[PDB]
Amino acid sequence: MAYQLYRNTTLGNSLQESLDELIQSQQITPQLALQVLLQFDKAINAALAQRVRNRVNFRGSLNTYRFCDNVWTFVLNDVEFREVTELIKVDKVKIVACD
Amino acid sequence: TVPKLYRSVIEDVINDVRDIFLDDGVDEQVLMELKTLWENKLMGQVEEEPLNSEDDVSDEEGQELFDTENVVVCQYDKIHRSKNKWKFHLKDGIMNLNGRDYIFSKAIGDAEW
Amino acid sequence: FGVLAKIVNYMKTRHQRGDTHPLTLDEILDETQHLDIGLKQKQWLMTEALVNNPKIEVIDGKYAFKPKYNVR
Amino acid sequence: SGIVPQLQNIVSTVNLGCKLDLKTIALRARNAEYNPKRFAAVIMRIREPRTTALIFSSGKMVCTGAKSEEQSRLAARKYARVVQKLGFPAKFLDFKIQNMVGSCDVKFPIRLEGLVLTHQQFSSYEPELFPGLIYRMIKPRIVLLIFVSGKVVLTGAKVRAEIYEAFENIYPILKGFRK
Amino acid sequence: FIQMSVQRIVEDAPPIDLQAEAQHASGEVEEPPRYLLKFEQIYLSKPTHWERDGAPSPMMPNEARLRNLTYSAPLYVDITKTVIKEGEEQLQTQHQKT
Amino acid sequence: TNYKPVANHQYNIEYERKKKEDGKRARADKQHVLDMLFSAFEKHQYYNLKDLVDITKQPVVYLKEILKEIGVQNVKGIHKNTWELKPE
Amino acid sequence: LSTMIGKGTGAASFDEFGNSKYQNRRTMSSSDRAMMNAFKEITTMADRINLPRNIVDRTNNLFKQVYEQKSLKGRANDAIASACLYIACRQEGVPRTFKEICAVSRISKKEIGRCFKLILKALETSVDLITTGDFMSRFCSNLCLPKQVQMAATHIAR
Amino acid sequence: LDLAGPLLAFLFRGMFKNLLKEVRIYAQKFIDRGKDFNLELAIKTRIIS
Amino acid sequence: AQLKFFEQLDQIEKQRKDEQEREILMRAAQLRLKQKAKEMQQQELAQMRQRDANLTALAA
């Protein structure tokens, strides 16, 4: 019962796998696992909002886009993420945005 | 840098879940075991009704099914488009490019359709 | 308590089905996607308060026959 | 006259004959967007015809951006086929061209002041509101935006014949006010 | 009258206090903004007549007699408007010679 | 300087910007609207339609239809005839 | 065809808890009350920029014709009144810019212009095109420029 | 003896009170709506004159 | 388990003391009633907040 964005990332996947292992071991109940996920979502949202103070840029081309329930699902190709300190090249990217 | 932010996030998460672990009556050792496993895992057609007259008018839908490529999840403040181009004021979020993770506060983007 | 009025609406649609039979609270809570814990106990305290004023009839035994006038 | 207007946008409405789920269409379609707070329909774009269509839950769809009648019909059919591929019983019923927009140049500056003085019954020139003169032709129900640079934009037409006839009517009048 | 009484009448009038009637039905911890208006420093111009064109011009008394005009002078007041929205900031905009 | 020519008054542009950003209230599904209505009623027994519209954040016509389905208007000595969220 | 009643004398006029005039007089119909409010708004707007009373009367007549014609019944009253004021100024030969009318009216310039177009269509009339010389007198006087400067500016623009 | 000054002062007292009353009413409407009323529009110039 | 029942009885005494040890602070300037009222208010927000979660999971 929260924003639930970072669950489908490396961090959320690792947390979910750990919770699955404890559930298999019966150490934690699924309700406790869900509560842990909710608290993680709150904490991660706050942490990114507060402790991140860097500005990034990127350019490229767009191949697809979708919008529903205030959820953008852009799909770009040949993107160049440009930053003052470093530049990164990617063949394709999917940008999921919410608010 | 990013690992240090990850460790700070670990501290915040454990502090945030302590109260729930007390509320549900579960012993605190669960949090230690969770952190251990989490760290280990990380590191003329007059009759026009038939639409079959045209075919292959779409593209491969497997990109969204795969999602294996690089993925960026963030929040958007303003998104404008003027007849050709899509413009992006994406605010603080996370990016997963080539496995390595990137963290940002302000993201500006211009794309063509 | 709002979920309780929603249960009342559910049993009203149940009357609309015409298959009204003596029931209980657990099966309704299951079919309405709600659980059976101490929450059901406090809402059952509210539900008995309802049984003190159930113009929509909710009796304890064989029940739910709301309509003060009812033949078919 | 030697000048023919070229169409810049065509608006066509077609009924699919079946109710639709806007949320499902937004979730499953490729380029569709749905913001019920902003607008009650679903906005979708296809690049090959280079058009945009609005799809409503009532089953009626509006296609805009097509440069030709054939392109408009093909784009509407493509949108209907996309909706049908999403599992809905979409059809192609009472397709009609509601409005057409054309543009052209007369290749000479025009004195809009004299034009509005001569044709005040049909002309409306308000530089405060809009620099272009608005001419409301009667015999064809066409609205023409005439500019001092000579560009003329015609709108409100149902068929290309109306666009061409309106330009043919307006051209001698404009030639009378060449700067 | 003009030099003292008009200014004193302006200053004697109590400041206008205005606030919304619990707008938005939110927590409403003094959330409705408070608008305070205070009139000050009245100014009088010389007698002036504005034509059909709207161009101001001095009005001679004989012209007032001939054209049945009224010999009057514009009256201007400085007004200070303060907005208190309980946002921890109060802004006091000043309107000059209203 | 008084009554200087302006294209649009400042307060009006601010109000229009706020309204545009907020947007029109969307018509949500019947189930969620009903659940929100029932919780609101749980707060206490009597609600006015205006504040109920504020609470539900739904179109007035759609909310009125859903409320007419279950709730009933009672003429009362509180101030006026208002809605009753109890179905019976 | 109405009257109204006052307090009168102090005796039986006020009753059990101060009944007043037995009542409040409660006169008229909306097809006249709305027009009356529009007339009041027109006078206020005109006095804001010191428009003469003849322009006010022409505005009132234009508003009566528009209001009875009823093609602008969906448009808010104040917009109609502001557009009528603009049209009356144009017909009297002393045009005020749309921004000048918006400065004294709560209605925005865009809405005033739209109602102006609609009123022109409803009345089946027209207004002479504005020229640079129309605004020279007011602009120069508000800038307090000399008469020679005003003449020079008018000649330069023409 | 009440000369021109005191009499006009009495009248101006009354009319300035009326002007402030009208400003109060006009601004209160807009404040209830949540718009930030313009002071120049609130002032009804005709009252005093 | 019997010891856990005794700890629950102690938590019940602690909640009574906290509610009453200041139902008195309010008087010096009903605490339990206020807490209950506060809990009642959240329910509506929680669900309006909550079902968004269900649709966002479907969306992503």
From TrEMBL, chain E:
It is found in: Nucleus. RNA-dependent RNA polymerase that catalyzes the extension of a non-coding RNA (ncRNA) at the 3'-end using the four ribonucleoside triphosphates as substrates. An internal ncRNA sequence near the 3'-end serves as a template in a single-round Pol II-mediated RNA polymerization reaction. May decrease the stability of ncRNAs that repress Pol II-mediated gene transcription. DNA-dependent RNA polymerase catalyzes the transcription of DNA into RNA using the four ribonucleoside triphosphates as substrates. Belongs to the RNA polymerase beta chain family. This is DNA-directed RNA polymerase subunit beta. The chain holds residues 127 to 224 of 1251 of the full protein.
